[PDB]
Design a binder for these strands. Structure first.
Ligand SMILES: [Mg+2]
Ligand SMILES: [Mg+2]
Ligand SMILES: [Mg+2]
Ligand SMILES: [Mg+2]
Ligand SMILES: [Mg+2]
Ligand SMILES: [Mg+2]
Ligand SMILES: [Mg+2]
Ligand SMILES: [Mg+2]
Ligand SMILES: [Mg+2]
Ligand SMILES: [Mg+2]
Lengths: 98, 199, 138, 109, 108
RNA sequence: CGCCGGAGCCUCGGUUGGCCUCGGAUAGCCGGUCCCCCGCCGGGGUCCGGUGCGGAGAGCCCUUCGUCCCGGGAAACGGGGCGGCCGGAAAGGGGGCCGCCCUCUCGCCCGUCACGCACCGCACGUUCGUGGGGAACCUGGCGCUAAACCAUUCGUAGACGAC
RNA sequence: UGGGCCACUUUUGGUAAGCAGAACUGGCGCUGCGGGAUGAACCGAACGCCGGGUUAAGGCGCCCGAUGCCGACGCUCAUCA
RNA sequence: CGGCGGUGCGCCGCGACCGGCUCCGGGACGGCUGGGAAGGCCCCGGCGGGGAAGGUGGCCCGGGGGCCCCGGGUGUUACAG
């Protein structure tokens, strides 16, 4: 794995995945990471990361999770997986993904 | 202090014996480009030797039997291990101070590589005799990173070519400089030529 | 393509063995791996000598394939092989190596002190040339 | 203000294939690779330097952690440049493949 | 090197202005003789200095007798080694072993 | 509790200058030139040089007693200590460059002048090294206030754990 | 003690046997040691406790002491050497 | 902080000479043989008489050239032996 970039906003559905006990936690996951998007230097660094991924990587896999609030199941913790992106050049794969 | 040897053009067993002896003596040895190691005898013979080794297996539970590594670096490492007394603390320490790689990783891409003329194919084998390439042998036995290493190696080769051209220009410039300042530096060129450091 | 050949008359340099560092001439070829050599003006008797301990030079002097000591000697003196070999860069490198081996401690200190300044000056002028090339290329 | 001792490696003990004689040690000095080339080092005294837990007295200084077992190069060994060394205490087996200092001062030049 | 004493110990001088080695005794075995000589035959060493002089007596203080003896000998010896170029610098430097330098291969 | 920023203690050992890089052929190689030919400087053509490799790992680089006077030689564009520009992903580079605020004519090579515990013949001396690891002494600055397991629940699980 | 066994050459029965039976000498049994990877009888050599030297049989790519000789002359390619 | 005669050193070390035993190195001298064999120098030692090719010049043919080199033919020292 070369680099991992997350979205600015991640729903509590996916946040539940990161905790073994969501009832006793403070829900602090990504609370300090989310600030990389709203700051000028942070988003400049993010664009630098995207440029590095564009110029170095070979296969691009996108992270997506199911919406479990639309289901009759008891559990509310979303299932997060990696789905590979197949297509043209790495640059346009990354552009489509972003 | 670390002995770095370029494996391209070397014979497997003869290089391994010297590596094992040096490592027992106490040097830290890194063997690089293990896909370029040669073995005497034709490819079909060598691959049947390795296929018989592959057939060797523990009947009761194969997961506990011999481990048949497919990487050329691991093949060389296992040969050295067989030449070492690896069932003792001394042999294990020797194996620890030995390090073996495939291709040329970039701690060592920028360092000069040594060769061992006692274990070179062109010196030890008659030109009419046949030989085999360890990279091809490993690929046909099950190694899965032959092309990746080739592309990375051609990248390294292009970068090294650029560096070598720059160095050639630089030291040609140095020779021009010495020709320029020979009038001033004659007082030392003569005392070096009278002791054999020059020409 | 080859440039040096083992024929009758070519002089050769003895790399190792008893008569190492001396020049011999091929007088006759005995077999695949043995030759008859003779140094008349360089302290080598007529004897069989293997090809493995010799290495040819770019000098050929003419005598019959079974000539005698006097005739080989006169051909050698006519050709002036001693002076030509002394002029040769091969012998220059040989004697430079000998002199460097013979160098002593005081000579080592002298050479160290001299090459310190020689490298310093050459490095400074190299920097000057780099600056000139950079300014003319920018 | 530099090194005044040559570098040697304690290769092993005097031995056959199945018997070990601990009172004699085998040494590789660097740069010497011939029996006729080992002649310089006969009679030179050699030392093994190691460190321990607590201090010991030192000649001309305050006590420190260093300790030394002294020896002497006796005669050559084989054809490849080995020599035989005899130490006033048999070298510990943990010193296999470690540095042994070979001095110069018992000189006869 | 100056002379050998009656006890077999070499009498070494050393120039104080060069390498801070005073009139001292040394052992013939623990030295290396380089192939560099000084035309010292035209130098007179005072007779009174001997093994009895140089032997340890019993904090050490340098006596005026030692200082004046050293002054005489060193003033006699300095000009003769100033006549050899770079010799003062060679004497002032310190011998040491570096990488790849093998004692059995180098002519001392 | 985390990063930047003082003496020390204990303990674990080794070590006693660096080499910063073409790719390769071996019945053949290496370095320049370009009057010439295509291509984004490279490949080739030509020619001239080396090849028991000297643009040689049989090699190269650094080469450490120190300080104090004057002279020569070398430098003058040099030596050291701030902001920008580039240098890298196979197991990411502490390298170069540009402007910089200041300073020295001191660094290197030849000479002149003396001096330092000259410790009285003697051993592990001389580094890498503010080394790795563990406790506390400590002056400040910039910062932050989690999660796992148990207990309970579930049954997509289950001998018990586990999930 | 009165169960023996093994080996060079000789030798009887048996197709043969690590079979069964004899002659000569030497061994193992009663015996450690260096070499033959490993082994009762094979090769060398027999033993108080040690230091230096040198050997036997066998060896000197590495395990593993020793050729890290600029060793000599040839033969041999084996997809079962 | 006495000279001698004898005993030893609190611990760690060093040197020198003597003798014994070993492993090497550097010199120089002489004997024997086919009273060494070959070989060196004295115009191939000189004087004559022969031999042949692993045939030198010479001559003949051809080619690669620009007088030299190369292959074959003949032959008996000539400009090698
Ligand atoms: Mg230390
Ligand atoms: Mg009974
Ligand atoms: Mg029977
Ligand atoms: Mg019994
Ligand atoms: Mg008995
Ligand atoms: Mg027995
Ligand atoms: Mg066997
Ligand atoms: Mg027998
Ligand atoms: Mg013994
Ligand atoms: Mg063996």
């Amino acid at each position: 794995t070369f680099k991992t970039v997350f979205a600015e906003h991640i729903s509590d559905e996916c946040k539940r995945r990161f905790y073994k006990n969501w009832h006793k936690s403070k829900k602090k996951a990504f609370t300090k990471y989310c600030k990389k998007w709203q700051d000028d230097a942070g988003k400049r660094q993010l664009d630098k990361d995207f440029s590095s991924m564009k110029k170095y990587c070979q296969v691009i896999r996108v992270l997506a999770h199911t919406q479990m609030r639309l289901l009759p199941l008891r559990q509310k913790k979303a299932h997060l997986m990696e789905i590979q992106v197949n297509g043209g050049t790495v640059a346009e794969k990354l552009d489509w993904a972003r | 202090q670390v002995l770095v040897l370029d494996g391209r053009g070397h014979l497997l067993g003869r290089l391994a014996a010297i590596v094992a002896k040096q490592v027992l003596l106490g040097r830290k040895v890194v063997v690089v480009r293990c896909e370029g190691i040669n073995i005497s005898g034709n490819f079909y013979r060598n691959k049947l030797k390795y296929l018989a080794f592959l057939r060797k297996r523990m009947n009761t539970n194969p997961s506990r039997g011999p481990y048949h590594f497919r990487a050329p670096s691991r093949i060389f490492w296992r040969t050295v291990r067989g030449m070492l007394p690896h069932k003792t603390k001394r042999g294990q320490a020797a194996l620890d101070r030995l390090k073996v790689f495939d291709g040329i990783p970039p701690p060592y891409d920028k360092k000069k590589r040594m060769v061992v003329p006692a274990a070179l194919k062109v010196v030890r084998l008659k030109p009419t005799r046949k030989f085999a390439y360890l990279g091809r042998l490993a690929h046909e036995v099950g190694w899965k990173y032959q092309a990746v290493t080739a592309t990375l190696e051609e990248k390294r080769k292009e970068k090294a070519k650029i560096h070598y051209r720059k160095k050639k220009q630089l030291m040609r410039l140095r020779k021009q400089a010495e020709k320029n300042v020979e009038k001033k530096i004659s007082k030392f060129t003569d005392v070096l030529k009278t002791h054999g450091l020059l020409v | 393509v080859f440039r040096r050949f083992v024929e009758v008359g070519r002089v050769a340099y003895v790399s190792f063995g008893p008569h190492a560092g001396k020049l011999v001439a091929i007088v006759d070829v005995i077999d695949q791996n043995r030759a008859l050599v003779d140094g008349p003006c360089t302290r080598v008797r007529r004897q069989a000598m293997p090809f493995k301990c010799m290495q040819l030079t770019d000098f050929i002097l003419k005598f019959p394939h079974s000539a005698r000591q006097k005739y080989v000697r006169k051909a050698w003196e006519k050709a002036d092989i001693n002076t030509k070999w002394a002029a040769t860069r091969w012998a220059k490198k040989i004697e430079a190596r000998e002199r460097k081996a013979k160098m002593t401690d005081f000579d080592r200190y002298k050479v160290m002190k001299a090459k310190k300044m020689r490298n310093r000056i050459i490095k400074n002028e190299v920097k000057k040339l780099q600056r000139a090339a950079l300014l003319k290329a920018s | 203000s530099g090194r005044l001792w040559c570098k040697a490696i304690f290769a092993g003990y005097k031995r056959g294939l199945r018997n070990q004689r601990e009172h004699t040690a085998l040494l590789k000095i660097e740069g010497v690779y011939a029996r006729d080339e080992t002649e310089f080092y006969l009679g030179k005294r050699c030392a093994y330097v190691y460190k321990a837990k607590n201090n010991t007295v030192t000649p001309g200084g305050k006590p420190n952690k260093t300790r030394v077992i002294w020896g002497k190069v006796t005669r050559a060994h084989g054809n490849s440049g080995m020599v035989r060394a005899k130490f006033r205490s048999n070298l510990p087996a943990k010193a296999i493949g470690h540095r042994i200092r070979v001095m110069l001062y018992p000189s006869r030049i | 090197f100056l002379k050998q004493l009656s006890s077999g110990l070499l009498l070494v001088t050393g120039p104080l202005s060069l390498n801070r080695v005073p009139l001292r005794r040394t052992h013939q075995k623990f030295v290396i003789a380089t192939s560099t000589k000084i035309d010292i035959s035209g130098v007179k060493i005072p007779k009174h200095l001997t093994d009895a002089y140089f032997k340890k007596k019993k904090k050490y203080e340098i006596t005026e007798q030692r200082k004046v003896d050293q002054k005489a000998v060193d003033s006699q010896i300095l000009p003769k080694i100033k006549a050899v170029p770079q010799l003062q610098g060679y004497l002032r430097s310190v011998f040491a072993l570096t990488n790849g330098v093998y004692p059995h291969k180098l002519v001392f």
